[PDB]
């Protein structure tokens, strides 16, 4: 009733049937309520972004020229740069930071990155489907100046007017990157948060986005900051370990399904889990990552959740540096608390 | 055998019998080994201080002129300043910081401070013994310029030559204070550590000093830094709570009994428990508190125990400040660790 989740699937224009159905959504242990789906012109929408709460905007025209993109058009135009393509034999593409792996010798990534040309990505993808294989690929590459000219012309056709006014109104920093994500149906990016703001622009296919506010930190159990999986949840949403992660029993999400033309504001520090709909075919998304506003030169109380998260990260970072080794951070913290604060 | 504790009591000169006996010592749950008792001229002694390990020095003449002090001589000469005198109905004089009590409304000190003149202290003391009362007093007052002239002349007669060379050789900072401690037999100062160096000069009576190295932090469970009892152990040595304080089962001490003329080096950050011998009469001690050496402008690994303690204190202090309230420090630390580092 109020945990209505994604709502009843919207009907595509010209009576082309429901855009997707409930059977295409994985099933999880926690409840969810809908993210509001609004017009760009709607004051409530503006109110939501202003308060750093998520909103799906349905008519921004942010990536209007990308709406025609598909593998053929992109193979033809995207140029000959290298693309990072992740490979796995599980649906879950857990993000990991390769620069942090030296310190965590026992971290064994379930997904592998292969650099390859776009045409190779399409071939590899084609091979899989034809031999009916089980491996999965997820291409995740920042857009850069090696892309061909039509892609340049597409990008330039994005609604910069609208998004630059957002960046200005919110006091955000610079646009840092636009990630192009191309995924196979049923792919999942497990829950994590970002230390930038994100307008997440869906282009092809459908993605279910499950978000949790920064105040659910205690229910989602991020990896240690020096771990490769910093910012990512330790919890396996498909098999939650309630003994290690008791407060995942209290977690409550905000969810939506985005399709072509939709843009989801994912506010900085908000947890998000992203899945490409089962049997939905391939998905394409391009994101827009902005540095957040500078923090006030002085802090007002009561502190917000995301400011406590920032504090916790800085304590872990400083401890890692002062102790000279990140693996001592935990023993020190435990000594700090046991019998004194727990 | 090697947990010989304080050793066999030394025999006073001129066959005046053992200075004290084992029945005068409270009994505790942990074992102890002896602190070395050495001559000032002994290279080992110098080696111990250099390494910041405790040593009882038997012949420094640090407070030679104070050796004649007793209540009469001091009532007569100590002047008319106010003396802080603590009062309690238990043997344990737990130190607390009055400036921190505002933040811990529920802290109820078992001992009370009364300012009073020395003659009043001696009267109050006299009254107690005569009416055979159970209350206890402990006078603890820094020596300052209000003291009378003979006390000034006594102080000036201290062995500054010897102790100034110590301060120099070790690279210590300034002498900050000389606390005069006058206690009733059976008084205990429960275990704590100091963030200064200490030469502890015994003048009258006997004190058993039990020390623990900085690396026993995990066994001794200091109060939170913003608590009034910062630097003091939470553990009741007379009734240890092994459920709250499991690692107090692993604690191992270094002990000695100091009498007139002895000086105990209590190195900075070393825990110490101090008791005036049962049925020993009153005790007098004067301490000498020096700021420690500046820390290296750069840190060498592996870090020492006392440097981890300094780190832990600075993390608690910074958290208290950033969160705007010391009582949030624990909830934040717990959120930091649960399911992530424990």
């Amino acid at each position: 009733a109020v945990a209505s989740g994604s709502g009843e699937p919207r009907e595509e224009a010209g009576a082309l049937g429901p855009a997707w159905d409930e059977s295409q959504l994985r099933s999880y242990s926690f409840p969810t309520r809908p993210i509001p789906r609004l017009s760009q012109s709607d004051p409530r929408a503006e109110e939501l972004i202003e308060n750093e709460e998520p909103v799906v905007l349905t008519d921004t025209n942010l990536v209007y020229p990308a709406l025609k993109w598909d593998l053929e058009y992109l193979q033809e135009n995207i140029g000959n740069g290298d693309f990072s393509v992740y490979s796995a034999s599980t649906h879950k593409f857990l993000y990991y930071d390769e620069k942090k792996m030296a310190n965590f010798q026992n971290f064994k990534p379930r997904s592998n990155r292969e650099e390859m040309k776009f045409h190779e990505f399409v071939e590899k993808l084609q091979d899989i489907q034809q031999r009916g294989g089980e491996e999965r690929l997820y291409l995740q590459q920042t857009l850069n100046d090696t892309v061909g000219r039509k892609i340049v012309m597409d990008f330039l056709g994005f609604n910069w007017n609208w998004i630059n006014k957002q960046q200005g109104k919110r006091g955000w920093g610079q646009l840092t990157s636009n990630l192009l994500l191309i995924g196979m149906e049923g792919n999942v990016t497990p829950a994590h948060y970002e230390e930038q703001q994100n307008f997440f622009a869906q282009i092809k296919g459908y993605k279910r986005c499950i978000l949790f506010p920064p105040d659910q930190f205690e229910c989602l159990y991020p990896y240690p900051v020096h771990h490769p999986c910093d910012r990512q949840s330790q919890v396996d949403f498909d098999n939650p370990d309630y003994e290690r992660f008791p407060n995942f029993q209290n977690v409550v999400g905000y969810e939506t399904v985005v399709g072509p033309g939709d843009v989801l504001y994912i506010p900085m520090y908000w947890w998000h889990h992203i899945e490409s709909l089962l049997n939905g075919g391939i998905t394409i998304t391009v994101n827009f990552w902005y540095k957040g506003a500078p923090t006030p030169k002085r802090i007002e109380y009561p502190l917000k959740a995301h400011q406590k998260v920032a504090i916790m990260r800085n304590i872990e970072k400083m401890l890692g540096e002062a102790l000279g080794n990140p693996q001592e951070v935990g023993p020190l913290l435990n000594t700090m608390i046991k019998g004194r604060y727990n | 055998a090697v947990a010989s504790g304080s050793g066999e009591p030394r025999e006073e000169a001129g066959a005046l019998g053992p200075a004290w006996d084992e029945s005068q010592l409270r009994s505790y749950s942990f074992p102890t080994r002896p602190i070395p008792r050495l001559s000032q001229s002994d290279p080992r002694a110098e080696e111990l201080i250099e390494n910041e390990e405790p040593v009882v020095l038997t012949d420094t003449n640090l407070v030679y002129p104070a050796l004649k002090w007793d209540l009469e001589y001091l009532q007569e000469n100590i002047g008319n300043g106010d003396f802080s005198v603590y009062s309690a109905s238990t043997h344990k004089f737990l130190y607390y910081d009055e400036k921190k009590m505002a933040n811990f409304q529920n802290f109820k000190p078992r001992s009370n401070r009364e300012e009073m003149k020395f003659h009043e202290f001696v009267e109050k003391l006299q009254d107690i013994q005569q009416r055979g009362g159970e209350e206890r007093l402990y006078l603890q007052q820094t020596l300052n310029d209000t003291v009378g002239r003979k006390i000034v002349m006594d102080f000036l007669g201290f062995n500054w030559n010897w102790i100034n060379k110590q301060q120099g050789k070790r690279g210590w900072g300034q002498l900050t204070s000389n606390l005069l401690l006058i206690g009733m037999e059976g008084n205990v100062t429960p275990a704590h550590y100091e963030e200064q160096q200490n030469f502890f000069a015994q003048i009258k009576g006997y004190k058993r000093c039990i020390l623990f190295p900085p690396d026993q932090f995990e066994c001794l469970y200091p109060y939170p830094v913003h608590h009034p009892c910062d630097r003091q152990s939470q553990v009741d040595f007379d009734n240890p709570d092994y459920e709250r304080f499991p690692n107090f089962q692993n604690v191992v001490g270094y002990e000695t009994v100091v009498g007139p003329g002895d000086v105990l080096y209590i190195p900075m950050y070393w825990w110490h428990h101090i008791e005036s011998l049962l049925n020993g009469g009153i005790t007098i001690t004067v301490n000498f508190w020096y700021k420690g050496a500046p820390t290296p402008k750069r840190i060498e690994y592996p870090l020492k125990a006392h440097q981890k303690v300094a780190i832990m204190r600075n993390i608690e202090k910074m958290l208290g400040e950033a969160l705007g309230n010391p009582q949030e420090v624990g909830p934040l630390l717990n959120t930091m660790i649960k399911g992530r580092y424990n």
Partner: peptide, 13 residues
């Protein structure tokens, strides 16, 4: 400065 933050995202810097 304990509330300061950097800009890490699920993509290489």
């Amino acid at each position: 400065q304990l509330t300061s933050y950097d800009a890490e995202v699920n993509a290489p810097i």
